[PDB]
């Protein structure tokens, strides 16, 4: 697996959540904010994101600003998913990316 | 990572469908009814269930308390339910024991 293309061409995404679900505890709690920084820190948005009177336009790579940001309007209550690119969805054979990978970490 | 079954084991329900526990003592059983199926999953009566009579469960969700088996996830929901599952559950372990390494390696 390695980085071969600039863009693979694919509108295939995956949604990382920013709520986790425990049984016994009803409702959905936010995740932790690590976690969801190792959930969406450097990816790209597949899709448009409209939040807290701002857009995230797609193919942005998500700064941890950004991250920071996509939290605030989580627990907000006007975001629950974000749309991102991840080596999953890669169309790329025998590799992925520079897209559906991320930041050079 | 050698996507093995585990001992302790859930069952998950196969088909999308409404939840029905039936048990005449000894003996227990959870039936995921729709209207083109109606499948029985008896279960010892020890195991612990995630589903309230009447609940609505979609396929590959699980109906008792263990580790999923990424083999019956696959046939389930497909290949991408099993991915997210594994990377949750790697996930899972690394942030129990503090390291922190994002979600893309
Ligand atoms: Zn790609």
Sequence with gaps: IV???AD????????VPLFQMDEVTRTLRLRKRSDIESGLYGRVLAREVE????????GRYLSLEDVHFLIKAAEAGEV???????????????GV??????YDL | ?????????????????????????DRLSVFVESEGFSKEYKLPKDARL???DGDYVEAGQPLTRGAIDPHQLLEAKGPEAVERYLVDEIQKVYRAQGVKLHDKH
């Design chain 2, 1 to 25: 990572f050698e996507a093995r079954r585990p001992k302790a084991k859930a069952v998950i329900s196969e088909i999308d469908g409404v939840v029905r526990i039936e048990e005449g003592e």
């Design chain 2, 50 to 52: 995630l589903v309230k």
């Design chain 1, 8 to 15: 693979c061409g694919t509108t295939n995404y995956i949604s």
């Design chain 1, 80 to 94: 629950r998913e974000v749309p991102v690119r991840s080596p999953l969805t890669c169309q790329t054979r025998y």
């Design chain 1, 97 to 102: 990316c520079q897209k559906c990978y991320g």
């Design chain 1, 3 to 5: 980085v071969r293309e």
């Design chain 1, 51 to 58: 939040a807290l009177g701002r857009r995230l336009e797609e």
